[model samples]
Target: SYDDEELEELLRRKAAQEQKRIEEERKRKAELESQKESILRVILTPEARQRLTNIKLVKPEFAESLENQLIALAQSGRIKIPITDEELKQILEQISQQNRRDF
Candidate 1:
């Protein structure tokens, strides 16, 4: 019976370890999402964010691609945006110009 008890104990410990890993993963994802939301909130005013949301609805693929690029740039310290509407407008205008350029 001692061997059986030892096996059960090992199984319980393995399950607990797995559960812990899953919790840690959830927390990591939550933190990343929070960071993304905070950056989006700070960079874009409420109105601007709403406009982006609308754009996302109309152009879901493009909007998501842009968001992913922006988020990666922001997380890497390559795209810095302070809480200023003028700066945000400038950045958005630059992005629009770059994307809509014609030969």
Candidate 2:
């Protein structure tokens, strides 16, 4: 039996256009997450970066300022390099109390 090769070709092009958009989003998300992880590796102790990974798992906040402040302190000389687990522990407590209130 004969078939509609024209319709098959049309479907391929249409689907690929959508596939192109999906590819773009995938790259951007990968780009930023890769950049953050790379820079954190430069600036954080092994255990400290691991704890940042932990926060991503359970953080209630929608925004990702956790890294913003952490990264910025290293930039601002407000904190020291290869930020350690102990320093990050202090940071977590400081933010946790600020983020939560009894009132």
Candidate 3:
């Protein structure tokens, strides 16, 4: 039969493992954000970056996904880098249209 001390030690180890897992995940996410920032600095004009920053204030998840897509497009040569404010407007318009719902 297992003693209480052994059970307590097992629980402590599990908690430590969980904490380490959480820390690793946080570090990975921070690294990705840093990479995304570098990509955006290269690809977005100041005005365009400001526009996305505003969107992030209200729709953070969407903005992050949009940033990832933009980076992928630029890296794949599907879209030109240093996207202008005008081009960003057009992309936002298209996204808005696709998100519309009929009631």
Clash pairs (backbone) in predicted model 2: none
Residue 60 of model 1, lDDT score = 79
Q: Which lDDT value does model 3 have at 56?
A: 85
TM-score of every model?
0.49, 0.68, 0.88
Give the residue spans of candidate 3 off by over 4 A. Answer: 101-103
Measured by TM-score, how close is model 2 to the native structure? 0.68
Question: Which scores higher on lDDT, 1 or 2?
Answer: 2
Global lDDT of each candidate? 0.72, 0.83, 0.90
lDDT of 1 by residue, 1-103 (tens): 6599899999999999999999999999778757766777866667666766677789977766766666666667765553345654676788889878852
Clash totals for all candidate models: 0, 0, 0
Worst 10 residues of 2 by lDDT: 60-69
- How far off is residue 57 in model 2, in Å? 2.4
Ranking by TM-score: 3, 2, 1
- Model 2 lDDT per residue over 1-103, tens place: 2258978888889899999999999999779978888989988999999988888778824225788777788888877799999998998888679878843
What TM value does model 1 have? 0.49
Which candidate model has the greater lDDT, 1 or 3? 3
Question: Residue 81 lDDT in model 3?
Answer: 78
Model 3 / residue 24 / CA error / Å: 1.0
CA shift of 78, model 3, Å? 1.9
